[PDB]
Design an enzyme around this catalytic site. Structure first.
Site: not given
Ligand SMILES: [Cl-]
Ligand SMILES: [Cl-]
Ligand SMILES: [Cl-]
Ligand SMILES: [Cl-]
Lengths: 210, 210, 210, 210
Positions: D10, D49, D81, D185, D188
């Site tokens: 990401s 992901g 992740n 979030d 990130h």
């Protein structure tokens, strides 16, 4: 007043049923007010192709985790587009071995998802509800798709902790009823398929909410 | 439990605040609950580029008519993209009438969807509430943009029948603070702008509901 | 060094060809370096279901309009998902009259798009290139889809200002070659269809770049 | 004309900065052009992901091998992740080994994709450049998260062979500024964080290319 918070990808959006036509989320909401005899407030967080790793990150957003903390029922769709793009790579290169790790990387994001929900809800709470929908097979003729989707659903059911956490058998809903339940794109369910999905969510029961 | 339906374009979607971040409709829902001490169920029918004629045509949809009839509060946005289209047409043709004709269509559709909302509910339920927001000027340095939007707003105030129907002065909220209330695209609001919009809605009161 | 800036929806993303498999954007890039004999730098701004009204707003984002200002060639896809969702509403309600205004509202956003590109490029610039792709018909059996897509392409060609602005005949590329050029989802093109698209963009010529 | 390929999760996508807003890879591309006085072509293979094993399996894709072979600069992100998954597994099982095993898999895949990059290019072109970024700690108040990520970073620095191969200290960039360098979030990065990341890449130099 009950609180329903729905998460997922293009299925939670309602892709395939048409613009503003009620998908499974809206129809499962209706069957909740009819069964539990109480008005329910709905809120949706979904996007086409939304990854499961993103959902685990989303749960840290203050507005999202607020809806989760008060959510009486939670639905989660996902990974339907990960196998689609994997099959499409197989369709071009004809290799059965592709870098897909849908079973490997999506399922581990699911268990981390459920744990973050537990942290937000608090361990003292035993009343809330979570419902994960597995994957249906939109290409019954393609045998490799039927092998991948069956293997994902076999490993997904292991995360079930009835009756709070239940894995909905979306596969059996569509088995033998593809052309009737799928939209004209044949990859997203029709308004009929979204109706059958909501009925399967209703079949899972409501645990301690009753 | 109160039912609040929301219709409109990208503003009702919440574009500009960030994906899954609360726009003005859910910040207004939270304040509605706080000011009336009652949970609120929210339904949103909105899409980017949804012009006013389409929003009027939605009201004949059976599922949308269901949520509008049950709605105690209704918010409507629109005609914002017609200003962008008109400014680009004026840049090429320099015709000052191109927006007045388009602005005349929006004011007609607003009056049309207003007439349908009461046709949907009837004479039994006059306790409904409609808050429609006018247009802000995202380009304050363009006098033609300010003149065009000011003319549409004074003609839009003709539709107000307080306290049941109120026209929210979005223009006054954004005037002078376009740097912080607009998002990266200089046309859609930011989270600050959406927060200020929701404050203007709560300031309008709630009529017969309180 | 040439500069290619690509905008659009799920077609510009490459949906249907698989993850990281080159769509028409990447293949049209390759045919540019082969024909014009110069390395080209590519940058993409696309999202599934991205509206045309959003693109007109995006062009105000500083990073986006910077890529447009220096762009030697510009490609634009869009509105393919607007007719899909409209057909899906027709598939459920069987009404030929739906609130779709794809021809009405998308085409007007296209002309405003091209004008904003002209403002960013400056009127003195006559060298740059813009290529709009019309819509193919993925459902040849459904006659209403063939009527809508043909009517949209008939009104879209009116925006052509050869050889700078050209409307690519994506319809003729897929006519009679659906099952060969479409992915397994049958709504997005296969890796074969993306290859044929790039060849049609090459057929349009490169104007003054040569 | 320089060719710069970017692979990862990401972070390489740019999640957190906002849709279409430049992440770290394109801010690093602009500074690369400024420091070397030469236009740069950018290709990005990234998805949310995408774990490290998949990124290694991508290098056998024919189209991806094409862009890696031509690449003068390569950036790789990953394993972020796995930390989120491990923290949720530790929250339930309290096993301190769960991340060390997962961190051991990332360090193995990083060494694997490094070995394949030279197998792709060979012995003729040693002028290539690889800048892989380590992990930052988005949860500074959790000592176990800081200890886990610090251990992965010191084991990751073993792979550095300056100036051709450099490990970018993303941890030092974010330490102490997680409030402003992280997005909504809390995991990130923000546009500030992506901007600071690109500054750290430009600070690393360019080796034999300059
Ligand atoms: Cl109630
Ligand atoms: Cl809009
Ligand atoms: Cl060159
Ligand atoms: Cl990720």
């Amino acid at each position: 007043t009950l609180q329903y918070t729905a998460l997922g990808d293009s299925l939670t959006v309602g892709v395939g049923a048409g613009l503003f036509e009620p998908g499974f989320v809206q129809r499962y909401k209706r069957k909740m007010e009819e069964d539990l005899n109480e008005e329910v407030s709905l809120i949706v967080f979904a996007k086409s192709g939304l990854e499961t790793s993103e959902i685990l990150a989303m749960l840290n957003e203050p507005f999202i985790m607020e809806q989760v903390k008060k959510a009486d029922v939670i639905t989660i769709t996902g990974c339907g587009n990960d196998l689609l793009q994997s099959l499409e790579i197989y369709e071009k290169e004809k290799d059965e071995h592709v870098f897909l790790e849908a079973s490997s990387h999506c399922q581990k994001n699911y268990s981390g998802m459920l744990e973050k929900i537990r942290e937000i809800k608090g361990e003292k709470d035993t009343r809330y509800l979570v419902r994960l929908l597995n994957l249906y097979n939109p290409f019954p003729s393609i045998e490799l798709a039927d092998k991948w989707i069956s293997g994902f659903n076999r490993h997904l059911k292991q995360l079930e902790s009835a009756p709070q956490i239940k894995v909905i058998d979306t596969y059996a809903v569509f088995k033998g009823r593809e052309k009737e339940y799928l939209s004209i794109d044949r990859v997203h369910p029709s308004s009929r398929g979204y109706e059958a999905m909501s009925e399967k969510l209703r079949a899972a029961g409501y645990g301690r909410l009753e």
